[PDB]
């Protein structure tokens, strides 16, 4: 049934963003983020398993956190001592536990974009 997935594209270089660290949180009632998963993007900028699947899918507010400065510094980027982008949180809601939520991230060290894809 339901599924959550992501796909990270490096727009500075025109490649998938491989070997990027990402964490998934569920934002609790209190507002406190509960860590669900730590993952790494594969060679195609995706994950080898869905972020959420089947019974894991629950309606609510979630947040993905992407380690973008780490990725770009590894790739050779020269960033400021305090980078403009370091950790990027993408906060979003899941309304349909049976829905397929695909959330791509396009990123450079000084810009990013995201959307509900398909």
Residues that bind its own copies (CB under 8 A): 59-61, 80-89, 91-96, 106, 110-116
Asked if residue 5 binds Cl ion (CB under 5 A), the reply is: yes
Binding-site size, Cl ion (CB under 5 A): 7
Q: Minimum Å distance from CB 107 to its own copies?
A: 10
Binders of Cl ion in range 63-92 (CB under 5 A):
79-80, 83-84
Give the count of alpha carbons within 13 A of 118, CB side only: 0
- Does 38 appear as a known binding residue? no
Using CB distances below 5 to 8 A depending on partner kind, what does residue 29 bind out of Cl ion, its own copies, none? none
Using CB distances below 5 to 8 A depending on partner kind, what does residue 5 bind out of its own copies, Cl ion, none? Cl ion
- Does 115 appear as a known binding residue? yes
- 39 Cβ contact partners less than 8 Å away, ≥ 6 residues apart: 21, 22, 23, 24, 47, 49, 51
Strand partners, 27: 33, 61
Q: CA 2, CA 53: separation in Å to the nearest integer?
A: 6
- 63 Cβ contact partners less than 8 Å away, ≥ 6 residues apart: 24, 25, 27, 33, 89, 90, 91, 92
Using CB distances below 5 to 8 A depending on partner kind, what does residue 102 bind out of its own copies, Cl ion, none? Cl ion
- Does 26 appear as a known binding residue? no
Residues annotated in a binding site: 7, 46, 115
């Amino acid at each position: 049934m339901g599924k959550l997935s992501t796909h990270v594209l490096d727009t500075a270089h025109g490649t998938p963003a491989a070997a990027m660290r990402v964490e998934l949180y569920r934002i609790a009632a209190s507002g406190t983020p509960e860590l669900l998963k730590r993952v790494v993007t594969n060679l195609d900028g995706r994950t080898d398993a869905p972020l959420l699947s089947g019974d894991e899918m629950r309606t609510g507010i979630y947040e993905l956190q992407f380690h973008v400065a780490e990725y770009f510094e590894g790739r050779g980027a020269e960033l400021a001592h305090e980078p403009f982008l370091d950790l990027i949180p993408i906060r979003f809601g899941i309304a349909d536990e049976d829905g397929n939520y695909h959330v791509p991230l396009l990123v450079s060290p000084w810009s990013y974009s995201t959307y509900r894809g398909s």
